[PDB]
Design a protein around this ligand. Structure first.
Ligand SMILES: *C(=O)[C@@H](NC(=O)Cc1ccccc1)[C@@H]1N[C@@H](C(=O)O)C(C)(C)S1
Length: 640
């Protein structure tokens, strides 16, 4: 029985060597070649496993229900059940039998071809036929396509039908001029090592209409992934790339010929979009006639995915950022439907998924404004926009009297002399400041004093009723918002800065839209939703109804009052409640610090839409309010 345990260890080591993919190690655990022992030599067994398991992309061999008993003086029968993963899914309940040979002081496996698959005889062969699945679509709330499989017009040249050294340069310059292509790049393409004279060398995809084709140029129809909105949704949707051998080694169910999601929703929803590969894995006779079918299922095309996104709102929100750094979130605040998630600047996902030059890709990566960032999912200090949450907290716990008038003299203020050189700063020298005045002029000193008056304990008590620390049920990679680094401020200065949205606060635009939805639901926080069919989830009694009915009229005055910080939006003539902000950021990079512009706005009459826009590292005389007119007009018209 001390040898039965040795045979157990031998079978375990053999299964492990197969599982780890080291077929040489597994083959060396077999006895010598014979008719009573192993059916093949070690190198023959290695090539058999390598060829067959590699053809089926076998990964993760796991055994169970093992039993091994003595059969003769040196024979030891073993048996187990096996499960393994292939290109067509899981092979479950595989019954493996065999024999072991004990000799001298070592136990080896009398190898037989039934140790590759249970029903394999002498020189049986394995066949695998597969049908690739079509990738599902991503569509907006009205069925318009955001990511589909289209028929693209590929442009290319045949170097043989181009010229003979003289007319070649003429046709190269003609094809380079008539298609906005660098004339040096065309020759760089027809001079790669893989090119041959009679070959078709692709260059670029033609977006729509096909110009006149000079000599050598030809248009071939090629089907592939297509993104209609382009850069306007590139961060959200993402792109797909060719599947590599390493992708297959990680997940065998990928079609070693299809496309895999590399970023955004295409990657987050890769499983539901790529479908399931159909086909048949069968054992055949040595002549080629089928013996038994191990696996067989038919193709399952990927299912479509419908988003809450509005395509027209998405394109308008993106275009309004003029290619500058920033982002925009538009929701229906009563349900959380994310109408638009724009981030700028952006990259071309169509030229990214087809053929992207490595200098173009390095330009995207080295761009200081970083077009690959999903800015709607990046944490920022919310700026002066955060006042209206602090004020709502101050109204709930009774610290703030909406009509009590603080007397503020100057543009700088500090609690006492212990603050040193630091002082809270406002832009407008208004002497008599109450709550409505503070929201209209965006007065930091009023907010800082009221925050210090209510104290850290009451402040954090009101803040904890929001979504700080929560992970929203969204297929977008993001970090949870935070009030500060630790659970305590341990600083009056940091407490005041957090009071007007400027401390260690980190809230991304989507989390901002969720927190600010309280003013459109009488203090109920409505979680944002991106998938159209999901049910609305909310969180009641975050702030009081009295605080909403007090602040929202003041937010109307931020627009309508002649000195309100959002008064330019009065030109729209639509019911608006807004709040602006300008956060100062110390970014060690160049001359002094930069600043971000923020705008929050929603319809206070019907609560039909809500918008949060930002400009990151803004230019002088630039702001989010300056650019919000078009998106606000659209949302006001189409979302009552
Ligand atoms: C809120 O964020 C406030 N911003 C500051 O106090 C810092 C600052 C930075 C640059 C210029 C001026 C002030 C106020 N909110 C914005 C705004 O609503 O646009 C103001 C510029 C009114 S300050």
């Amino acid at each position: 029985t001390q040898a039965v345990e040795a045979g157990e260890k031998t079978v375990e080591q053999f299964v492990q060597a197969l599982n780890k993919g080291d077929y040489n190690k597994a083959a060396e655990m077999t006895s010598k070649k014979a008719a009573n022992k192993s059916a093949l030599s070690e190198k023959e067994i290695l090539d058999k496993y390598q060829n067959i398991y590699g053809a089926a992309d076998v990964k993760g061999l796991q055994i169970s229900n093992l039993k091994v008993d003595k059969k003769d003086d040196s024979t030891y029968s073993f048996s187990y059940k096996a499960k393994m993963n292939t290109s067509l899914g899981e092979l479950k309940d595989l019954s493996y039998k065999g024999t072991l040979d004990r000799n001298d002081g070592q136990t080896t496996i009398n190898w037989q071809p039934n140790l590759v698959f249970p029903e394999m005889e002498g020189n049986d062969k394995v066949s695998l036929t597969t049908q690739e699945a079509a990738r599902g679509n991503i569509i907006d709330r009205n069925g318009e396509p955001l990511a589909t499989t289209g028929k693209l017009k590929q442009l290319g040249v045949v170097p043989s039908k181009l010229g003979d050294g003289g007319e070649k340069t003429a046709n190269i310059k003609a094809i380079a001029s008539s298609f906005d292509l660098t004339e040096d790049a065309i020759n760089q393409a027809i001079s790669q090592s893989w090119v041959q004279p009679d070959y078709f060398v692709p260059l670029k995809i033609i977006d729509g209409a096909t110009p006149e084709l000079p000599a050598g140029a030809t248009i071939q129809e090629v089907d592939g992934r297509y993104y209609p909105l382009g850069e306007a949704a590139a961060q959200l949707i993402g792109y797909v790339g060719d599947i590599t051998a390493e992708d297959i080694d990680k997940n065998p169910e990928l079609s070693s010929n299809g496309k895999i999601g590399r970023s955004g929703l295409e990657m987050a929803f890769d499983k539901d979009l790529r479908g399931t590969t159909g086909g048949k894995l069968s054992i055949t006779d040595a002549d080629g006639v089928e013996k038994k079918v191990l696996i067989e299922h038919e193709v399952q095309n990927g299912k479509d995915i419908k988003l809450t996104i509005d395509a027209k709102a998405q394109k308008t929100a993106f275009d309004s950022l003029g290619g500058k750094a920033g982002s925009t979130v538009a929701t229906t605040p009563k349900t959380g439907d994310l109408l638009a998630l724009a981030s700028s600047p952006s990259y071309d996902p169509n030229k990214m998924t087809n053929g992207i030059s490595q200098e173009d890709y390095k330009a995207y990566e080295e761009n200081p404004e970083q077009p690959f960032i999903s800015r709607f999912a990046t944490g920022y200090a919310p700026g002066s926009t955060f006042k209206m949450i602090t004020a709502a907290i101050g109204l709930d716990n009774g610290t703030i009297d909406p009509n009590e008038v603080l007397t503020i003299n100057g543009l700088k203020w500090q609690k006492d002399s212990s603050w040193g050189s630091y002082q809270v700063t406002r832009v407008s020298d208004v002497s008599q400041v109450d709550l409505k005045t503070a929201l209209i002029y965006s007065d930091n000193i009023y907010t800082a004093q009221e925050t210090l008056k209510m104290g850290e304990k009451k402040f954090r008590t009101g803040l904890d009723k929001f979504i700080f620390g929560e992970d929203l049920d969204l297929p977008i990679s993001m970090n949870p918002a935070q009030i500060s680094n630790e659970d305590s401020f341990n600083s009056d200065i940091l407490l005041a800065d957090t009071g007007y949205g400027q401390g260690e606060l980190l809230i991304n635009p989507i989390q901002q839209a969720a927190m600010y939805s309280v003013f459109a639901n009488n203090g109920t926080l409505v979680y944002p939703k991106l998938i159209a069919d999901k049910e609305t989830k909310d969180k009641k009694n975050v702030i009081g109804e009295t605080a909403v009915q007090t602040i929202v009229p003041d937010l109307r005055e931020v627009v309508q009052d002649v000195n309100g910080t959002a008064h330019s939006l009065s030109a729209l003539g639509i019911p608006l409640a807004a709040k602006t902000g300008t956060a100062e950021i110390k970014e060690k990079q160049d001359v002094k610090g930069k600043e971000n512009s923020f705008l929050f706005a929603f319809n206070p009459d019907n609560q039909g839409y809500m918008m949060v826009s930002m400009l990151e590292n803004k230019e002088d005389d630039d702001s989010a309010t300056k650019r919000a007119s078009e998106l606000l007009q659209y949302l006001n018209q189409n979302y009552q």
